[PDB]
């Protein structure tokens with residue numbers, strides 16, 4: 056519903072004034088869906104990437120803050136909110152460049168504002184690679 | 194054309210109702226067809242059409258508000274099927290599109 | 295205690311535990327989805 | 341003051357002798373400074389509907405609540421639990437299933453499913469402390485009894501917990517007690533010359 | 539996706555008029571008569587039902603089910 060008038064002086068060059076009690080009731084409400092995918096490949100050497108579980112705090116028996124939203128299979132769970140620099144997939148790759156040694160390469164949520172996880176997709180290609188996609192909602 | 198013998202062919206594919214021909218049910222949908230529209234899917238039920246065209250044979254028209262409750266199926270089926278043969282007048286259903294020859 | 299995933303086509307619990315190719319136990323569909331968590335989340339009604 | 345019409349949920353009346361700068365003040369108080377009770381916190385356990393949780397919380401925020409706001413106090417800064425004095429608490433819990441008996445043609449959703457529409461009659465009030473006796477049965481409810489919230493398919497489930505608090509309309513527009521409050525001056529169309537004929 | 543609970547402009551609770559609006563269109567009213575019979579005076583409330591598209595009825599076809 057548009058009234059065409061000169062109001063309040065904040066509408067000089069193409070700027071337009073809105074209604075605060077219309078934005079509260081649902082006008083202009085948008086959703087932004089993003090993506091975060093991670094692959095877990097098998098190498099020519101018989102070694103493979105892996106997802107470790109959440110690393111607990113022994114004094115509190117709760118996970119650490121950077122691993123707060125992870126499920127028991129190392130993958131972030133749908134329904135919970137992510138803040139900045141929390142992990143989503145607890146990946147570990149081999150440094151093959153006798154026992155294999157792993158380094159950590161976690162998929163973390165870079166982003167200035169929070170996001171809710173809606174669904175986590177798990178599928179596999181034909182090359183034994185595991186594909187993991189997350190849908191993120193703001 | 195052999196315009197006298199051919200009615201034993203035409204009787205199998207069309208039947209005369211209210212002075213005019215009406216397409217028979219088996220031409221449009223055999224009994225395994227999926228819903229042709231969006232919204233909630235529905236299964237085919239040809240007597241759910243044939244009862245409607247039967248009502249046009251006995252009454253003047255289908256004349257009442259809520260036949261979709263009596264026949265249980267979607268309004269989105271009945272009001273879409275009817276829309277290929279008729280035009281709406283206010284409250285009294287649909288109008289038969291061509292005069293009584 | 296085990297993990298439970300949801301099939302993409304038929305919506306059945308699969309419980310993928312060992313290192314197996316990702317495949318539904320009942321259909322042949324090869325995409326899984328995680329379940330919703332059991333922890334609560336708190337929203338503002340704004 | 342001449343009251344000319346009144347029924348349930350409407351009122352029309354006249355004020356003679358007051359000026360614009362006070363009638364406008366009354367309109368602005370009725371829009372933005374008269375407090376009501378509305379949902380602010382929604383605690384979610386297993387939302388599996390297609391409606392997003394933020395959108396669902398936003399829809400549950402705007403439902404008007406029949407609590408009388410002269411009886412409650414403002415929740416303090418912080419204090420995320422809230423007690424008997426300053427909150428109410430509704431519980432929505434709907435599970436959708438298939439109807440085990442239906443016809444074979446089975447087209448409409450009203451025969452195939454049950455609880456596939458979440459109205460606001462599925463909200464059940466949960467008392468706190470002594471609120472069971474300060475209020476009789478039925479005075480704490482949502483008002484409209486028919487507002488669609490979500491809509492489900494069998495297997496999907498909605499279970500949450502609401503926390504109504506007190507707030508004014510200047511803060512957020514779900515606290516406004518009125519649909520629209522306004523006025524107009526009264527017309528006096530006058531005839532300068534006698535109009536006759538056609 | 540779904541009918542909003544309130545009108546954006548004034549604040550009348552529109553969100554319970556949708557299932558009744560479809561039922562009055564099943565009784566073969568015109569839209570200008572059904573919107574008057576539901577009690578919508580101003581046009582800001584009338585465009586809430588008049589311009590709404592019910593996408594959740596068709597988005598729920600693609601939702602996963604048992």
Ligand SMILES: [Zn+2]
Pocket residue numbers: 301302303304305306318319320321322323
């Ligand atoms: Zn399957």
Ligand SMILES: [Zn+2]
Pocket residue numbers: 545546547548549550580581582583584
């Ligand atoms: Zn309005």
